[PDB]
Design a protein around this nucleic acid. Structure first.
Length: 75
RNA sequence: GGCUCAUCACAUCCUGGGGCUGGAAACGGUCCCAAGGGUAUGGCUGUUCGCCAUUUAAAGUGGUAGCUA
């Protein structure tokens, strides 16, 4: 599923900061990450293989680029 | 898909005038009175907490949609 993050170019977030921060979770591989779309204040990042909800309910409180952020289903 | 949003918060930094005073000078101190302002733009192998580059007088952290090639 597509996830929203209140982070983007203006918080100096990049596609990698996600890719790196996510893969390092027992249960998730880098192949599970679909398209990532950085924007001004929001990033879209797609999860594959139904591993969406899990990631989501784990990202809720994890330092990405050293800054926990709003995450949840895109919409 | 191009340019245009903030108000705040704790910071932090840049820019005066005037009496007196230190000092051989260069440069300072002190007291009185200020008025404003900056903290930005862009790069980097799609395994994160950075790195780098300019140009800022002054280069940080946090809270939430319009005019047109």
């Amino acid at each position: 599923m597509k996830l929203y993050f209140n982070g983007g170019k203006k918080k100096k977030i990049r596609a990698v900061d996600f890719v790196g921060t996510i893969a390092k979770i027992d249960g998730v591989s880098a192949d599970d990450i679909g398209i990532i779309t950085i924007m001004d204040n929001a990033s879209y990042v797609e999860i594959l293989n139904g591993k969406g909800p899990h990631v989501l309910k784990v990202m809720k409180n994890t330092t990405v680029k050293g800054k926990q952020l709003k995450v949840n289903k895109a919409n």
